Amino acid sequence: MRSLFSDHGKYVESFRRFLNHSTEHQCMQEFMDKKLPGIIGRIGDTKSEIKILSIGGGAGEIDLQILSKVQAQYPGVCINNEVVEPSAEQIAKYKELVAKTSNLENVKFAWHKETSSEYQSRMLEKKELQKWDFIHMIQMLYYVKDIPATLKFFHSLLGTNAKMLIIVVSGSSGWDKLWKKYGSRFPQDDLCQYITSDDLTQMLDNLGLKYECYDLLSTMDISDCFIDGNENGDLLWDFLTETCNFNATAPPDLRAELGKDLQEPEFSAKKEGKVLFNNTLSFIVIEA
Ligand SMILES: Nc1ncnc2c1ncn2[C@@H]1O[C@H](CSCC[C@H](N)C(=O)O)[C@@H](O)[C@H]1O
Ligand SMILES: CN(C)CCOC(c1ccccc1)c1ccccc1
């Protein structure tokens, strides 16, 4: 079997299906609407510039949501929003979104096409550690090799009253049950590792950092996955399993087992015939 990651065209089509077949971004929009204001409400105090470091910012959708809340809290204050993103393709879409969006006149953007570890090394030999007011790592720690080192390093870059936000799937999510039970059966690329809030809270406790973790229910419409030959269903099958052409390349036995479990309460909830996979997210806020 081939991991969905070794086929950009596939991964992109699969992912796109995901965002359009779940409450991922809405769930986050809810957090940004009801929680973020209180979280970043004092990060700009006493400053004439608010520095925001986006790690794994991707295409910029969530980043702008965040920018909107900081501006609302600090009218007229200049914002330096730097992005660390290894994908040239993502960076291009990000810049495109910025141009097509209004009310961003007070924000300065800067994109660094590198990974978070490459950014770290590039900074360490600068023998001048810069400070940031808000650092966020949204749904990207899966792609980081050394997580504890990453957490300690970026936490060391937090300035006065600064905060760091990390988002990953919750240990109570369906993904957690999925990876525990079928993880070994799925393809394995050294380009990613399974991570849940459980892993991060253990690491944070051991690092001795101060933090708070909040979970918000989120679902993934897996209904269509049941209909044979269905377009949306199969696309979502590849995603969920992180494999190219699952409903056609995966052993018939594995397909049956998994197909049944996805129906179990541990993984999903059957509401109005609609099958909703548990995509609960965890939002972790670390203090300077
Ligand atoms: N080692 C690494 N360091 C930083 N970003 C990385 C990375 N490996 C992958 N990424 C980036 O991590 C992102 C994961 S998808 C992230 C979603 C984005 N933050 C938003 O919520 O929509 C992609 O844009 C990807 O290219
Ligand atoms: C992050 N959300 C979208 C949950 C699904 O996570 C997935 C995932 C991410 C991208 C594409 C398919 C599946 C994952 C697989 C392996 C290692 C780490 C994560």
Swiss-Prot record:
Location, primary (coarse class): cytoplasm
Cell location: Cytoplasm
PROSITE patterns: SAM_HNMT
GO BP: any one term: methylation
Transmembrane feature ranges: none
SUPFAM superfamilies, per database record: S-adenosyl-L-methionine-dependent methyltransferases
Binding site for S-adenosyl-L-methionine: G56, E85, Q90, S116, I138
Top-level enzyme category: transferase
Catalytic activity: histamine + S-adenosyl-L-methionine = N(tau)-methylhistamine + S-adenosyl-L-homocysteine + H(+)
Record keyword Chloroplast present: no
Claim: Cell inner membrane is one of the keywords in the record: no
Entry's Gene Ontology cellular component terms: centrosome; cytoplasm; cytosol; extracellular exosome; nucleoplasm
E.C. code: 2.1.1.8
GO molecular function term, any single one: histamine N-methyltransferase activity
Pfam families: Methyltransf_23
Keywords: Cytoplasm, Disease variant, Intellectual disability, Methyltransferase, S-adenosyl-L-methionine, Transferase
UniProt binding sites for substrate: E24, N279
Assembly: Monomer.
Record family assignment: Belongs to the class I-like SAM-binding methyltransferase superfamily. HNMT family.
Disease tied to this protein: Intellectual developmental disorder, autosomal recessive 51: A disorder characterized by significantly below average general intellectual functioning associated with impairments in adaptive behavior and manifested during the developmental period.
Primary role: Inactivates histamine by N-methylation. Plays an important role in degrading histamine and in regulating the airway response to histamine.
Full protein name: Histamine N-methyltransferase
Organism field: Homo sapiens (Human)
Gene that encodes it: HNMT
